[PDB]
Amino acid sequence: RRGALIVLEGVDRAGKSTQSRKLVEALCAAGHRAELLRFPERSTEIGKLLSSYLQKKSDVEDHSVHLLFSANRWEQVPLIKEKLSQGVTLVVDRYAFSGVAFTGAKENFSLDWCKQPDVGLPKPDLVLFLQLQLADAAKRGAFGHERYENGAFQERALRCFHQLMKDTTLNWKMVDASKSIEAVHEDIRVLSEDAIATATEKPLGELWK
Amino acid sequence: RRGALIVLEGVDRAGKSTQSRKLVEALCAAGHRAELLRFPERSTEIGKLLSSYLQKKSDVEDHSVHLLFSANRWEQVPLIKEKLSQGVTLVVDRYAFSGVAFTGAKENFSLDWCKQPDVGLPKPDLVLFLQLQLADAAKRGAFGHERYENGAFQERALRCFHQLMKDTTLNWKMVDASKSIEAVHEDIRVLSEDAIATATEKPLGELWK
């Protein structure tokens, strides 16, 4: 009985990390085997290049960095497939969607080109998109100092996210991330319990193919 | 008057590195501004991951390593465009073709998927393919100990190379690499002088688009 692959995507400060963490804790408290993953995963060789780039300690050509973000997901595929096959549900804090939306926000990057490297990755059974008015998201304190942490770039990534959501091959679920942390959690949790109960029914798919 | 982008591809031990070196020396002796590049370029962060992988000091998931080889070319695009625009012809010892042929030789890698990351790179004005009977190429001493240095894998990369050569958007030129080092050089050199003289006539193209 395989585990489910559940991804959280969403506007900046939309609550992806808080909800990913709470979701795993709640699933495990309700007797599921669930573990948390995030992207980028900064602990590998690739991830350390990505962390330095996001912190602006290094500059990386735009196509190269896009490919490194994708490679960073592929290096985890063997582990993802193994965990799911063993019945462990995986909750993932950002995935290929963020990859495509962020590079796709830069000038002269087509969505098609941005998606290709991630074609074939493990297909999520559930993709939650935490929706929040960009302005309320900036009221969630203030912008950090990493790359992309500005208003104009975020609006352009949001547009790309909306294009990806026309992709009917994927089980997208909109979440109203403007509610309290606990109210948002309870929405996410019920949609996740549903997905887990149906993921044991059809094999793990392949993304964008 | 832009420089030309000339790539050498070819079967193992076909003579790509020797000819790349001789070609640059001859072009410069004949008053051209020409410089040598190679892929993978093992001096960058990415290139050191690639060198360790090829030497088998490290194992890398197959999709991730394919993307790293491509990223390794994109990190050099800014320099490639700048050099060509300044009138410097660039002689390149392996390029995206080797990227696609080598991963494309592994099971379950489609040529389409393998080409995507390199879509958009600077399009070579001339692609020389050094042809040699795989057996005569093994008579060029013996196999080293790096990855892919075996007979069965080389035949499968050669097949992929032949599929890429049906790509009429590219100026492929077959070279008979079984002749002497000097005879092969003289063939390559004349085809290169021709390409350089025509590359000042149309803008640098984009690969596979």
Ligand SMILES: Nc1ncnc2c1ncn2[C@@H]1O[C@H](COP(=O)(O)OP(=O)(O)NP(=O)(O)O)[C@@H](O)[C@H]1O
């Ligand atoms: N529903 C919520 N209401 C109010 N504040 C929240 C809510 N969810 C999270 N926060 C706070 O807002 C900040 C961002 O939350 P976080 O879960 O880190 O978002 P995130 O989407 O992962 N951000 P990022 O990784 O920067 O895109 C943190 O201080 C959270 O405590």
Ligand SMILES: Nc1ncnc2c1ncn2[C@@H]1O[C@H](COP(=O)(O)OP(=O)(O)NP(=O)(O)O)[C@@H](O)[C@H]1O
């Ligand atoms: N035309 C030739 N005839 C005979 N030996 C040659 C010829 N060209 C190169 N060699 C020798 O064959 C070996 C391989 O040459 P090299 O130029 O390094 O090939 P290469 O294609 O770059 N190999 P690789 O990088 O391993 O695919 C070297 O010892 C060369 O001196």
Ligand SMILES: Cc1cn([C@H]2CC[C@@H](COP(=O)(O)O)O2)c(=O)[nH]c1=O
């Ligand atoms: C997964 C992924 C992410 N991104 C961006 C989103 C914001 C930043 C991470 O920020 P956090 O580490 O704070 O989640 O990195 C990309 O540009 N491409 C990708 O493939």
Ligand SMILES: Cc1cn([C@H]2CC[C@@H](COP(=O)(O)O)O2)c(=O)[nH]c1=O
């Ligand atoms: C450019 C490139 C190369 N290759 C392989 C060809 C043989 C080895 C390099 O060997 P040499 O360093 O000895 O040329 O690396 C890939 O697998 N993908 C690529 O994108």
Ligand SMILES: [Mg+2]
């Ligand atoms: Mg977060």
Ligand SMILES: [Mg+2]
């Ligand atoms: Mg060589």
Ligand SMILES: [Mg+2]
């Ligand atoms: Mg396509």
